[PDB]
Amino acid sequence: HHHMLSKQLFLNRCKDVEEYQKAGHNPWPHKFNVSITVPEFIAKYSGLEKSQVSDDIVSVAGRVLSKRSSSSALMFIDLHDSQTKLQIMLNKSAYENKEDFVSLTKMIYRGDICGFTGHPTRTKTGELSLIPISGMILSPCLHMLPSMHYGLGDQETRFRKRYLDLIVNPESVKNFVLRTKVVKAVRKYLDDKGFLEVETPILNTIPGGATARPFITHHNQLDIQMYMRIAPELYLKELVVGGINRVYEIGRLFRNEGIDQTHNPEFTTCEFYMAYADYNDIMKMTEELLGNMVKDITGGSTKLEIKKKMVLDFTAPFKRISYVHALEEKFGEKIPRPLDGPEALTFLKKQAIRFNAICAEPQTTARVMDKLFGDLIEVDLVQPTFVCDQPQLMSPLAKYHRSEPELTERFELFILKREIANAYTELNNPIVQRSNFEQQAKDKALVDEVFLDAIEHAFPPTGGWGLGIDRLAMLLADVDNIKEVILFPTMRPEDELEKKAREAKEDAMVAQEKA
Amino acid sequence: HHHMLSKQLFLNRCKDVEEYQKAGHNPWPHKFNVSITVPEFIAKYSGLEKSQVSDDIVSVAGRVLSKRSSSSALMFIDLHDSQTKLQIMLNKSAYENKEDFVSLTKMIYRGDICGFTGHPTRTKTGELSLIPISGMILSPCLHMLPSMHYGLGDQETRFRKRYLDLIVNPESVKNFVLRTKVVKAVRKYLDDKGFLEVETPILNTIPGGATARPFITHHNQLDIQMYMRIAPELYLKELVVGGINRVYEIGRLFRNEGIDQTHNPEFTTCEFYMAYADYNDIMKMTEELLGNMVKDITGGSTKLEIKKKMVLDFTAPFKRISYVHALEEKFGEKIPRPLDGPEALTFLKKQAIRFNAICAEPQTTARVMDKLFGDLIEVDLVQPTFVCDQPQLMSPLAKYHRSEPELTERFELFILKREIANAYTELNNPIVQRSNFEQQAKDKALVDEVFLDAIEHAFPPTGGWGLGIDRLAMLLADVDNIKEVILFPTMRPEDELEKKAREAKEDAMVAQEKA
Numbered sequence A, B: 001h002h003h004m005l006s007k008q009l010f011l012n013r014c015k016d017v018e019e020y021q022k023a024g025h026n027p028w029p030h031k032f033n034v035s036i037t038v039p040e041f042i043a044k045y046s047g048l049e050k051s052q053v054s055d056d057i058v059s060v061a062g063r064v065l066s067k068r069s070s071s072s073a074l075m076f077i078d079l080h081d082s083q084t085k086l087q088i089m090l091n092k093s094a095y096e097n098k099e100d101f102v103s104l105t106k107m108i109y110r111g112d113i114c115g116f117t118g119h120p121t122r123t124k125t126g127e128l129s130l131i132p133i134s135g136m137i138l139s140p141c142l143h144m145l146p147s148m149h150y151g152l153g154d155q156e157t158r159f160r161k162r163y164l165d166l167i168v169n170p171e172s173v174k175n176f177v178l179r180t181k182v183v184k185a186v187r188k189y190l191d192d193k194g195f196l197e198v199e200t201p202i203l204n205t206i207p208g209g210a211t212a213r214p215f216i217t218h219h220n221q222l223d224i225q226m227y228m229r230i231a232p233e234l235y236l237k238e239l240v241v242g243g244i245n246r247v248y249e250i251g252r253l254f255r256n257e258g259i260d261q262t263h264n265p266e267f268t269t270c271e272f273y274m275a276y277a278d279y280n281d282i283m284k285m286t287e288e289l290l291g292n293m294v295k296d297i298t299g300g301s302t303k304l305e306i307k308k309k310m311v312l313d314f315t316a317p318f319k320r321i322s323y324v325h326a327l328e329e330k331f332g333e334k335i336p337r338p339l340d341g342p343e344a345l346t347f348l349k350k351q352a353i354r355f356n357a358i359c360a361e362p363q364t365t366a367r368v369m370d371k372l373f374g375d376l377i378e379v380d381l382v383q384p385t386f387v388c389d390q391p392q393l394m395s396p397l398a399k400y401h402r403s404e405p406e407l408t409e410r411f412e413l414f415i416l417k418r419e420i421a422n423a424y425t426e427l428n429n430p431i432v433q434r435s436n437f438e439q440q441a442k443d444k445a446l447v448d449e450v451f452l453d454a455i456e457h458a459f460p461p462t463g464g465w466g467l468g469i470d471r472l473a474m475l476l477a478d479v480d481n482i483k484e485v486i487l488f489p490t491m492r493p494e495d496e497l498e499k500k501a502r503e504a505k506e507d508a509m510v511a512q513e514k515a
C-alpha cells in the first residue's frame, strides 16, 4: 500500500481546507497588503530593546515553518520571507477578534502562507517579533514539507523539486542571486562602453560547421528542417559588417550531447564583438570586468575558496603564458620548426612517453600536443591566467599571429584548471575564411554562404570574446556541480521504479514520526 | 550568362587585393588604433571655423561610402562610422609618405574599411573634415555595395541580407537601438523593485497544455522527445512557491505556426510574477513603466505617430473599461445572467446580427462574445486602455473576481487596436487548478504534475504580468511589420528561381551603369 500515509494526509488536508471554507473563511484571499518585508522589518525595528513594544502598525506575510505554543492563549510562529525569519507572537489578549483567534490558531498548518498585522516588539527572551491584532491564511499547504534541512546531497530529489529545495535549503538561493549579479556586471560593463545588446536567431536552416551535435526540429508551414544554435558568432559578426561596431549577446545555446556535472543540454554564454580591437585589448577588458565582479562580492580583488581554505587572486594583471613556450619551458628545450611537420611529431612523441605516460590515437600532432599540454601544464593553472598564441595546428578558424610564425592571435583564460573565457583577433580575410569553411565541411563529412557574402563585403578588424556564464557562476559560488547554478537543470524522467521507491521512503519518514 | 558582371567584378577585385599585397601592403592589418569615434569627433571639433585647422592629431576609422577627387593631389572621402559621416580630405602635400599616398588613393574602393590619422579641420566650404598624415586599408570590399538608399520597400532583399540593409539604410539602426532601450527600461524598472532576473528551461519533456503548436526536437542520450517552450509561466510560479517573491524573465518563446507581419516563429516576451500583489497593482506598474519609456523617447509622456501625424497619450492614468459593461454600453442594455446560459446566447446572437453583420461557427457563447467584442469595441481602442474583468467564459485559467460574479481578475492592455500586455491576479487554488488542467488536457485531445505538486505545497497570492517585446518595439518605432524590429527574421529559403532572378537584376543594375 505504497505511499498510503501521504495520500491520507493530502486527503484530510483538503478536508480541513473545505471545512475551513464552509465555516466562512476564504483559504485563498485575493489581496493582502504587505506594508513591510521582514528584512526591512529587521532593519527598521532591530533597535528595539527587550519587552519594548512599538506603537507602529505594520503588516507582514510569509511561510510558516514553525508553529509551537506554550499555551492556548500564546502561540509562536516562525514566519519566513526572503530567506529571513520573523517570529509571530500570537497573544490572545492582544488579538482584536477573539473568535477568529481560536479558529485561525487551530487551522494554521506548517507550510501555510500567512499574513499578520500588528506591533513590532522584542520579547524578554530577545527575539524580535510581531504581535498581531489580526491575521489570516493566505494560502494553505496541502502536503508535509520536509524537515530543515533535507536532501544533502541526494542531488536527485533536490533538482527534481527545485521549489522544495529552495524552501528547505534557503542557502541555495544565495547562488542564484550571485548568478544574476554576474550577468548585470557584464551587461553594465559592456553597455557603458557603447555595446548594443542584441538578439539573434536560435533557430537556423543551416546546421553549422562545428562538429558539435545539434538539436533538430521542424517548421511546419515552411516544411523545412531547422537547427538550434551552437553559437551566435556569425550573426553578430554580420552585425559588425553592417555598421554596428560593438555588439553583444547573452544567450542560450544548445548541445545535443551528454549530461554531466559540467554539462547541461542548454547553457548560457556571453559573446561580444568589438571593431578595431585586438585580443590584448580584450585581455585587459577581461581583467577589468572579472575584477569588478570579485570586488563586488568581497570589497577586495582576492577571493577565498575551498581547498578548508585557499585564495584566488583576481588582482590585475593576470599572469599570461605562451602555449608552445610553456610546453618548451617544461620539456627542456624547443620543438622542431614546422610544428605540423614529421620531425616535430616524432619529437613530441618522445616527450609523450618521457613525461605524460599517457596519450591517445589517432596520433595527429594536434592531439598529442593537446594531451601533452593537457596533463603537463593545463593541470595545474589554478590562479587566473591567460594562455596565448596557440598554434595554427590547434586553431583552424583563427587569424595568424602578426610577428611570430605558426602561431595565432587568441587566448584562453584558465582558472582552477578550467577554461572560463576566450578571445580572438578575429579572422577577417574572406578568401581564407571561405577555404576554412569548405575544409571544415569536408572534414565533417551545406556551408553558410550568407555569412561568407557578408564578410566578402569587408569585415572590419574586430576583437571577439566569449564567456561561460554557468561555469563562471560555478566558480564564484564555489560549487563543483553545474546544476547548483541552474534553476531547473535537465532531468532524466524518473520511471516507476525510483518513483515508487521515492514515495515509499517519503512515507517511511512519516512512519518514523508516528511510531 | 546570368550574373556575369558581378562574378567579373568579384574576380578582378580579388586580383586587385592580391596585387596590392604583392606590392608589400597588408589588406588586413591586425590592429589600427582609433583614438576617436566620428560622433565624438563631431562633438569635439564642430566649433572649428572655416579653413581653420586644429593642432591635434587624431585617428578615425570607418567605411568609405564616397570617393571622388577634383585632382590627383586632392581626394575627398565620405567615411562612415556609427551611422555618422566624416569627410577625409586627402591632400598630397599634407600626407607624409608621398609614395604610399599614390598607391593608397588609387587602391581605395567604395565599401572599403579604412583608417586615417591627421588633423581635424573645417574646409572653406563648411565641411568638417580630417586631413590625413597617414592612412591605410583596414579591410577591402570585394563586391559592389548597392546605392544609397536601396530596397524600399522590397522587404525580401532587405531582410535576407540584413548586413547590407544596415549599411544602405542606416536609419534602420534607429529601430534596434530603440528596442534595446526598451528591455533595459523594463529590467531597470523591475530590478529596482527587488525582482530577481532568472533563466528557466527552453526545452521541456512535457508539451504544455496550451493549444499552440510547439517545435519538437529530440535528446539523444536520454532518448526522449522534447518541446520548445510556449511560456516560462510554470517555472517562474514554481520559483514563487519556492520562496523567491519577485521574479522575471525576458525570454525567447517558440510557436510552430504561420509567418505574417505580426508573427515570427521565435519571439521575445517579458513575464514577471510578484507575490502579494494583484492586477490593480500591476496596472499602476504598467502605467509607470510605459510612461518612463515614452518620456525617455521624448521628454514628455505624449508620443507622436503616423495617421501624417497623430498622438498616443501615455499619460497616467490610462483609461480602463469593464468587458461586459462596455459590451452592454454599446448594445443598449444588459446581457442576461448566467452569461454561459442559453438565454444569454440567444440574446447575444440578436446583437450579432443587429450590429456586427459578422460572426462564425461553432457558435459558442465565448466565440460570439469574442467576435462581438472583436469588431464592435476592440476596434477601435487607439489610446492606451485597460480592458478588465473578462468573464469566466473567456478566462479558463484565471481567478474569480472578488466582488462581482461571473467575472475574473485580469486585464489586457490595448494600444492602437492591438494587445500589448496583460496581467492577472493569479489562480492559486491547487484543486481548481488541477481540475482546469485535466479539463484542458481533455479539450486538447500528459499533464504537468510537477507544477501541480508545487502549488499544492501552497502558492502565495501573486500578480502575473506579460509583455510582448517585439510588438512594443513595433509600436514605439512606428512600424507595421515585426521584421522591422527583429534583426534576422525567419526567411523561407529562396530556391533557384528567385535566386537567379535576383542576381540577374543585380547585374542588370551594373549594365544600367556601364552603358
Ligand SMILES: Nc1ncnc2c1ncn2[C@@H]1O[C@H](COP(=O)(O)OP(=O)(O)NP(=O)(O)O)[C@@H](O)[C@H]1O
Binding pocket: A255, A262, A263, A264, A265, A266, A267, A268, A269, A419, A420, A421, A467, A468, A469, A470, A471, A482
Ligand atoms: N553543455 C554545456 N554546459 C555548460 N557549458 C557548456 C556546455 N558546452 C559548452 N559549454 C561552455 O561553452 C564553451 C565550450 O567550449 P568547448 O571547446 O566546446 O568545450 P568542450 O569541447 O565541450 N569540452 P569541456 O571543456 O569539457 O566543456 C566553454 O566556455 C563552456 O563553459
Ligand SMILES: Nc1ncnc2c1ncn2[C@@H]1O[C@H](COP(=O)(O)OP(=O)(O)NP(=O)(O)O)[C@@H](O)[C@H]1O
Binding pocket: B255, B262, B263, B264, B265, B266, B267, B268, B269, B419, B420, B421, B467, B468, B469, B470, B471, B482
Ligand atoms: N509569433 C509571434 N510573434 C510575435 N509575438 C507573438 C507571437 N505569438 C505570440 N506573440 C505575443 O505573445 C502574445 C500572444 O498571445 P495570443 O493570445 O496567443 O495571441 P494570438 O493567439 O497568437 N493572436 P494575435 O493577437 O494575432 O498574436 C501577445 O502578447 C503577442 O504579442
